[PDB]
Amino acid sequence: SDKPVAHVVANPQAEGQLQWLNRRANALLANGVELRDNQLVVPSEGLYLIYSQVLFKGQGCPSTHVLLTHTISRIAVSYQTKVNLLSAIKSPCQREAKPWYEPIYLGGVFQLEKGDRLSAEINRPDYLDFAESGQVYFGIIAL
Amino acid sequence: SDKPVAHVVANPQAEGQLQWLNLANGVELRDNQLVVPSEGLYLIYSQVLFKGQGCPSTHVLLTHTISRIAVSYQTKVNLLSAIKSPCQREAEAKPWYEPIYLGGVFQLEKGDRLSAEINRPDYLDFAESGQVYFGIIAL
Amino acid sequence: PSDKPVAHVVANPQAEGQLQWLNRRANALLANGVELRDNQLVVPSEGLYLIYSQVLFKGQGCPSTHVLLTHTISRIAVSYQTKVNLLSAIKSPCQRAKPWYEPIYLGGVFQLEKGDRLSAEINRPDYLDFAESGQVYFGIIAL
Ligand SMILES: CN1CCN(Cc2ccc(-c3c[nH]c4ccncc34)c(OCCc3ccc(-c4cccc5ccncc45)cc3)c2)CC1
Numbered sequence: 001s002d003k004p005v006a007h008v009v010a011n012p013q014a015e016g017q018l019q020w021l022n023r024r025a026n027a028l029l030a031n032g033v034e035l036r037d038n039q040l041v042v043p044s045e046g047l048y049l050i051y052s053q054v055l056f057k058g059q060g061c062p063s064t065h066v067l068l069t070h071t072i073s074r075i076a077v078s079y080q081t082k083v084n085l086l087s088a089i090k091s092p093c094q095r096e097a098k099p100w101y102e103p104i105y106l107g108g109v110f111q112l113e114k115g116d117r118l119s120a121e122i123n124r125p126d127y128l129d130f131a132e133s134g135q136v137y138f139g140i141i142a143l
Numbered sequence: 144s145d146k147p148v149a150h151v152v153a154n155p156q157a158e159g160q161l162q163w164l165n166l167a168n169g170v171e172l173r174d175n176q177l178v179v180p181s182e183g184l185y186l187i188y189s190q191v192l193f194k195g196q197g198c199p200s201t202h203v204l205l206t207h208t209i210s211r212i213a214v215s216y217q218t219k220v221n222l223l224s225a226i227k228s229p230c231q232r233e234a235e236a237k238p239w240y241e242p243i244y245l246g247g248v249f250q251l252e253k254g255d256r257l258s259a260e261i262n263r264p265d266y267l268d269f270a271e272s273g274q275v276y277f278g279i280i281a282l
Numbered sequence: 283p284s285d286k287p288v289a290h291v292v293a294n295p296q297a298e299g300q301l302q303w304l305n306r307r308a309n310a311l312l313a314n315g316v317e318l319r320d321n322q323l324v325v326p327s328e329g330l331y332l333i334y335s336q337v338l339f340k341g342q343g344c345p346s347t348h349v350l351l352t353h354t355i356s357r358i359a360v361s362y363q364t365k366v367n368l369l370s371a372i373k374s375p376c377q378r379a380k381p382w383y384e385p386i387y388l389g390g391v392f393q394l395e396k397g398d399r400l401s402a403e404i405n406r407p408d409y410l411d412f413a414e415s416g417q418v419y420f421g422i423i424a425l
Contacts, residue, residue: 201380221414221416222416223419224417226385227383227385228381231344231376246334247334247421248289249290249311250311282284
């Protein structure tokens with residue numbers, strides 16, 4: 001099978017930032033997919049399933065009202081055109097100490113071109129949970 | 144060289160409804176259902192997105208189900224199904240977004256019909272927090 | 283006629299307070315070498331595998347304080363019998379006797395070895411909802 005695939009996970013050696021890595025235990029890059037400048041690089045044109053899940057965690061609900069965002073964007077090599085493919089906003093606090101857990105999960109099927117770069121970004125890396133092995137991931141599967 | 148596939152998307156113009164739009168190698172979209180062209184193993188998958196205005200009650204239930212209509216029985220059997228309670232606790236009411244995913248491998252027969260339905264089409268949304276699709280891929 | 287190892291297992295609706303996987307039932311299967319032994323899927327050959335699962339949780343009202351629901355897909359190495367997490371997700375169904383429903387869907391691409399055992403586990407089997415078909419399943423597809 002020649003179809004491009006990748007499943008990348010949060011690098012724990014880089015806490016305070018969401019840095020993706022093809023970690024040895026549960027992550028990989030195959031059939032042309034490269035990981036460059038924290039982005040997944042598409043080797044060929046076609047329909048791809050793009051997916052990601054991030055887990056935020058905080059202890060208590062103080063000061064004001066916290067906004068957690070997760071975003072998947074595409075950069076085409078032509079004109080360096082940047083477009084938002086998937087995005088989601090979540091507010092973990094309804095006034096207030098007890099810890100909260102806010103997962104954000106995104107996915108869809110998209111037409112990608114050769115050289116397309118895909119990034120998966122969060123606004124609050126300080127809330128990212130590095131507790132268990134595979135809760136923070138990003139991937140692409142060519143159909 | 145090739146295997147039966149379909150990737151159908153929902154119509155944004157079909158207000159308060161889940162209507163699929165077009166798909167290759169004999170996979171046909173007929174009566175808002177995917178038609179299996181030949182016997183074999185198929186990856187069946189779907190995604191729906193729901194959006195509500197706020198949380199006026201916690202009794203709101205969202206469901207999404209993929210069903211098979213067998214040709215030699217004409218019965219509707221559940222292949223994949225999910226239930227979600229989008230609201231916990233009830234101020235200016237803020238919209239919520241909830242995607243539901245389904246997917247599995249099934250042995251299907253020539254002429255089997257597959258439908259992908261939701262209980263709350265009034266909540267169906269086309270924002271970037273998800274996508275609205277249904278598909279089959281022959282393995 | 284597909285030669286690739288595949289499997290789609292479903293939960294036993296008769297195994298009270300447990301997550302026990304079954305095949306040969308109505309719309310479940312094991313094909314091209316995939317075996318079900320000790321509640322785990324057994325890999326027949328080295329390669330990349332599409333791994334997916336769904337569990338549904340149901341509770342009547344919100345007791346204790348805040349309950350954490352988790353779903354984890356693990357790789358049990360054939361050599362050292364080491365258990366490693368591949369995919370994992372957490373959910374907080376209670377936000378401080380009325381029923382709530384929480385589905386957890388996991389998916390990804392993984393490199394597996396011949397004889398690898400895959401498990402799909404949950405921390406609260408007492409909240410599992412298998413009342414109807416297609417609610418709780420686990421499966422693999424060789425690429
Ligand atoms: C031999 N060929 C077979 C077909 N294959 C392409 C292909 C097509 C469809 C699916 C699929 C299954 N269930 C689905 C549910 C919804 N949408 C799509 C799917 C697929 O599954 C690979 C495993 C997988 C399953 C779910 C997800 C997932 C989908 C959507 C949001 C997410 C958010 C967070 N985490 C995970 C997400 C990610 C990977 C693979 C190419 C090779």
